Design a protein that fits this description.
There is one protein chain. The chain is rod-shaped, with a radius of gyration of 13 Å. By secondary structure, the protein is mainly alpha-helical. It has one helix and no strands. This is Bcl-2-like protein 1. Belongs to the Bcl-2 family.
Length: 28
Protein backbone atom coordinates (compact mmCIF):
# COMPACT_ATOMS: atom_id res chain seq x y z
CA UNK A 1 0.00 0.00 0.00
CA UNK A 2 0.97 3.64 0.01
CA UNK A 3 3.19 4.76 2.85
CA UNK A 4 3.96 8.23 4.10
CA UNK A 5 6.81 9.38 6.28
CA UNK A 6 7.22 12.57 8.25
CA UNK A 7 10.37 14.20 6.91
CA UNK A 8 10.34 16.68 9.79
CA UNK A 9 10.27 13.78 12.24
CA UNK A 10 13.28 12.25 10.53
CA UNK A 11 15.09 15.58 10.49
CA UNK A 12 14.24 16.25 14.13
CA UNK A 13 15.31 12.75 15.11
CA UNK A 14 18.51 13.14 13.10
CA UNK A 15 19.21 16.53 14.67
CA UNK A 16 18.57 15.15 18.14
CA UNK A 17 20.81 12.18 17.37
CA UNK A 18 23.50 14.51 16.06
CA UNK A 19 23.30 16.62 19.21
CA UNK A 20 23.54 13.54 21.43
CA UNK A 21 26.42 12.19 19.35
CA UNK A 22 28.13 15.57 19.37
CA UNK A 23 27.79 15.71 23.14
CA UNK A 24 29.15 12.17 23.41
CA UNK A 25 32.09 13.00 21.16
CA UNK A 26 32.64 16.28 23.00
CA UNK A 27 32.64 14.47 26.33
CA UNK A 28 34.98 11.86 24.90
Amino acid sequence: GQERFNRWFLTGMTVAGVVLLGSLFSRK
